[PDB]
């Protein structure tokens, strides 16, 4: 539950910190935009060098919570919620398609011109 705009702004580059330490970089691009919804194509990059591809549908529900659905080329789906932790970080929590749950800290990359560390609390 967080205002939608917090996801468009900034540079379209982030890093997904998984629960175990695995970091996967996200290069994403917003294609369509609605007052209620947002669509975007996303490209992941593992630490070993493997890429992926996704189309993610973001939307705010009735009660104001941010929910998302992600479609991958492995026939694999993901569904969850996005809670903003600070201006650059939002926590995804959700369930994959086979049922396995997960939690991922999606942080955004800040430029060199300024303070990279962002607690913002």
């Amino acid at each position: 539950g967080t205002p939608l705009w917090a996801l468009l702004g900034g540079p379209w580059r982030g890093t997904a910190t998984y629960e175990d330490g695995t970091k996967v970089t996200l290069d994403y691009r917003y294609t369509r935009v609605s007052p209620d919804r947002l669509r975007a194509d996303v490209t992941y990059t593992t630490p070993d060098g493997t890429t992926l591809e996704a189309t993610v549908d973001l939307w705010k529900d009735a009660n104001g919570v941010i929910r998302y659905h992600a479609t991958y080329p492995d026939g694999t789906s993901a569904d969850g919620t996005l809670t903003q932790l600070d201006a650059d970080t939002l926590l995804a929590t959700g369930t994959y398609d086979d049922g396995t749950k997960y939690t991922v800290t999606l942080t955004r990359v800040a430029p060199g011109s300024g303070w990279h560390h962002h607690h913002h609390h």
Binding site: W5, L8, P11, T31, R32, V33, P35
Partner: protein, 127 residues
């Protein structure tokens, strides 16, 4: 500073749309749009390096409007900052035109979305 030319360039297109909307009044929704735009004008006198540029609007399979994005114009250097402000305001006026025409045809929070998004991309806050 160089910021000033940008602020002026903002109020330029602002008064452009003042003119268009006032001549088209002959319409309460038009007046609420006019209200909000002059409401934002008084904060003009900021530069964002990353600017979203919309190519246009596409309606989905139902009565759902969408704002198609061209790309984000990341201006590395200063002159590019001004020149991305240019390309951005030009595409913004473009989409605004298609938007007014569509709203009078089809007859939805789309317009206040448009306005508040300008507010956001310029001042940095939802409002």
């Amino acid at each position: 500073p160089i910021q000033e030319e940008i602020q002026k360039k903002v109020r330029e297109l602002l008064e452009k749309l003042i003119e268009y909307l006032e001549e088209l009044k002959e319409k309460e929704k038009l007046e609420e749009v006019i209200e909000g735009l002059e409401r934002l004008k008084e904060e003009v006198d900021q530069l964002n390096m990353n600017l979203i540029v919309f190519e246009g609007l596409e309606v989905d399979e139902e009565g759902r409007v969408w704002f198609i994005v061209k790309e984000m114009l990341h201006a590395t250097t200063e002159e590019e900052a001004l020149e991305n402000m240019d390309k951005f305001l030009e595409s913004w006026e473009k989409v605004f035109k298609e938007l007014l025409e569509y709203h009078f045809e089809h007859n939805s929070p789309t317009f206040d979305f448009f306005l508040d998004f300008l507010w956001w991309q310029l001042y940095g806050e939802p409002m």
